[PDB]
Design a binder for this molecule. Structure first.
Ligand SMILES: CNC(=O)c1ccc(OC)cc1
Lengths: 300, 237
C-alpha cells in the first residue's frame, strides 16, 4: 500500500480519492491519505468549500514515484508534487502515520468497483491525453477543453482525446457513403482499432478515462468523448464478441457508480436510447440495459 | 441555417445555389398479388435539381433498374439522390459549382452532407418553405421524358422557358411555385386552365404555353382561384 502525504490543509476543501470523498476544514490537521492500493491508477481531486467553481485533480500511479500534495497560496490550489529524496519522503510519511493524521483509503474487500472502472486506464497513456511531460502525474479540471472542442483555445492545457467524427472523411470511404454512415464497422475496426488505438484494451482505456473525467470533474468534453466512443461501437454491425461482452461490463460499472442526482447532465438521452433500443448492438448489452432501465427509467 | 419567409430573397442573389427535391426519386404503384397479398411495382423517377435564379433544371432520371435487388428502397433513394447530386457538382466547372444546396426535405441533409464531404465549403441547408416541387411530374414534357427513359439519363431544361427576358427571377419563381401548387392541388383543373385556349401553344423548346404578359395575369389569377377553391372544397368553407 502507498501514501500521498499533505503538507497541510489551509483552506476548507472536499477531497476526493477515486470514488471516495471527505471534507477537510480550514486549517484542520490533515496530512494525507494512506493505504492506497498499489496496482491501479488513482485520482485525487478537490473542490474548494468557498468556490465550487473548478473541480480539479491529479491522475497518478504510486508505482511511478513518491507524490505529495501541498497548497500553493499564490496559485490558490492544492498542487501535486514529486519528492525525489526517498529517505526524506519515508521519514515524512512515517511521522504522519505515527501521529495518525491521515485518512485510510477505505477499500471494502468485496469491492472491485475501482478496478472495474480503471481496468484499461494506462498511466503513460494518460500523459499522452494530458500533455505536461515534466510531471509523472496529470492535472485535469472542469474547464479543460478537448482538441476537438478547440477545432470547433490554449493547446497546452487541452485534453488530447482521439477525434471521432461520424461525418468526416476519416469515417467515410469514398464510394461507401451510405454503407459506412449507417454501419460504422469500417471506422471502428479499421480506422480506430487497427489504425489509432492498435487494440481494444487501448480503446477501452480512453473510453474509461473519458468517463471518469466527466464524472469527477464534470468535464463536458470528456462526456462527449465517452458517448462518442460508446456510439461508435453500438453503431457498428461487426464488433468482436469479446469487445461487446467487455463493453457491457464496463458500462455497467460506470452506470452503477454515477451519482443518481447527476444523471441529468452526464447522460445523453439520444445516445443511450439509440444504443440500447435502435442500434446494431441493441441486444448485446444485457447488463447495462438492465441497470439503466432499473436506475434511470426516466431517461428512456 | 434553414431557409424560410424571412430570408426568401437570398434565392435570387448572385451566389450560385440549387434546390434539390427527392420526392419523385422512388415511385411505385401498389397492387394486389394473385395470392391476394400486396406488392409494389417501381416506375421511373427523377431528381429535381433547380437553380432558382436561372431556371436551369438538372433532371436526373432514375430508371427502375437502379432498385433491382436492393433493400430498404425509401432509404436508399435518399442516398442515391445524394450520390447523383454530388456527381453533378463534381461534373461542373468550379466556377459553376453551387455555394449552397437547399434540400426540400430534412431527411436529405445527412445523406447529402456525407456525399459532399469533399466540398466543405458548400453549405447544405434545409428549408421551412413547403415548396410544391413534387408536382414537377405534372409537367407533361418532364413526365414524358422520365417515363420513356430506358436507362439512367440526365436531361437539362429551363423551367422558366423564356420568362426571364421579361420578368425577374423572383417573379419567375413566384409564377412557377403558383403553377406547381395548383397542379399539386387539382391537376385536372390546373391543366384545363393552362390549355383551354387552343390558340396559345407550347413551343417545342418550352414547357409551358406562350402566354402574353396580360394572359399570364389572367392565368395566374385563375390558378389562385383554383387553390382557394380546392381549399374550400377540402375544408368546407
Ligand atoms: C489514445 N490512445 C490509446 O491507446 C489510449 C490507451 C489508454 C489510455 O488510457 C487513458 C488512453 C489512450
Amino acid at each position: 500500500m502507498n501514501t500521498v502525504p499533505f503538507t497541510s490543509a489551509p483552506i476548507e476543501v472536499t477531497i476526493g480519492i477515486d470514488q471516495y470523498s471527505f471534507n477537510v476544514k480550514e486549517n484542520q490537521p490533515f496530512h494525507g491519505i494512506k493505504d492506497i492500493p498499489i496496482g491501479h491508477v488513482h485520482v485525487i481531486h478537490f473542490q474548494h468549500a468557498d468556490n465550487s467553481s473548478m473541480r480539479y485533480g491529479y491522475w497518478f500511479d504510486c508505482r511511478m514515484g513518491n507524490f505529495y500534495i501541498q497548497y500553493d497560496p499564490k496559485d490558490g490550489l492544492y498542487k501535486m508534487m514529486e519528492e525525489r529524496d526517498g529517505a526524506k519522503f519515508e521519514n515524512i510519511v512515517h511521522n504522519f502515520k505515527e501521529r495518525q493524521m491521515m485518512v485510510s483509503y477505505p477499500k471494502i474487500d468485496e469491492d472491485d468497483t475501482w478496478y472495474n472502472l480503471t481496468e484499461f486506464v494506462q498511466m503513460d497513456k494518460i500523459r499522452k491525453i494530458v500533455r505536461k511531460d515534466e510531471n509523472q502525474f496529470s492535472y485535469v479540471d472542469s474547464s479543460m477543453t478537448t482538441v476537438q472542442e478547440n477545432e470547433l483555445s490554449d493547446p497546452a492545457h487541452s485534453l488530447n482525446y482521439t477525434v471521432i467524427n461520424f461525418k468526416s472523411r476519416e469515417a467515410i470511404r469514398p464510394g461507401h457513403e451510405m454503407e459506412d454512415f449507417l454501419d460504422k464497422s469500417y471506422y471502428l475496426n479499421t480506422v480506430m482499432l487497427q489504425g489509432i488505438f492498435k487494440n481494444s484494451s487501448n480503446y477501452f482505456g480512453e473510453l474509461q478515462f473519458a468517463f471518469l473525467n466527466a464524472m469527477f470533474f464534470g468535464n463536458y468534453g470528456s462526456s462527449l468523448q465517452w458517448h462518442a466512443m460508446i456510439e461508435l461501437i453500438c453503431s457498428s454491425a461487426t464488433v468482436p464478441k469479446h469487445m461487446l461482452d467487455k463493453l457491457d461490463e464496463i458500462l455497467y460499472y460506470q452506470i452503477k457508480t454515477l451519482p443518481e442526482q447527476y444523471s441529468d447532465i452526464l447522460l445523453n438521452e439520444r445516445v443511450w436510447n439509440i444504443c440500447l433500443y435502435s442500434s446494431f448492438q441493441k441486444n448485446s448489452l444485457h447488463n447495462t440495459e438492465k441497470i439503466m432501465e432499473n436506475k434511470y427509467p426516466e431517461l428512456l | 441555417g434553414a431557409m424560410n419567409s424571412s430570408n426568401y430573397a437570398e434565392l435570387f442573389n448572385n451566389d450560385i445555389k440549387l434546390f434539390v427535391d427527392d420526392t419523385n426519386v422512388y415511385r411505385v404503384t401498389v397492387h394486389k398479388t394473385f395470392e391476394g397479398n400486396v406488392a409494389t411495382k417501381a416506375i421511373n423517377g427523377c431528381i429535381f435539381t433547380l437553380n432558382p435564379k436561372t431556371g436551369h433544371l438538372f433532371l436526373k432520371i432514375i430508371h427502375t433498374s437502379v432498385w433491382a435487388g436492393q433493400k430498404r428502397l425509401s432509404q436508399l433513394a435518399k442516398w442515391k439522390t445524394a450520390e447523383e447530386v454530388s456527381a453533378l457538382v463534381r461534373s461542373l466547372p468550379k466556377e459553376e459549382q453551387p455555394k449552397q444546396i437547399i434540400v426540400t426535405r430534412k431527411a436529405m441533409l445527412d445523406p447529402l452532407e456525407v456525399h459532399m464531404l469533399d466540398f466543405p465549403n458548400i453549405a447544405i441547408r434545409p428549408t421551412e418553405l413547403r415548396l410544391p416541387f413534387s408536382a414537377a411530374m405534372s409537367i407533361d414534357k418532364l413526365s414524358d421524358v422520365v417515363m420513356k427513359a430506358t436507362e439512367p439519363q440526365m436531361v437539362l431544361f429551363n423551367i422558366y422557358d423564356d420568362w426571364l427576358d421579361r420578368i425577374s427571377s423572383y417573379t419567375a419563381f413566384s409564377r412557377l411555385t403558383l403553377l406547381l401548387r395548383a397542379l399539386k392541388t387539382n391537376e385536372e383543373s390546373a391543366k384545363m386552365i393552362l390549355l383551354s385556349d387552343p390558340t396559345i401553344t407550347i413551343k417545342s423548346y418550352h414547357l409551358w404555353p406562350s402566354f402574353t404578359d396580360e394572359q399570364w395575369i389572367t392565368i395566374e389569377s385563375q390558378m389562385r382561384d383554383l387553390i382557394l377553391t380546392e381549399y374550400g372544397r377540402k375544408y368546407n368553407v
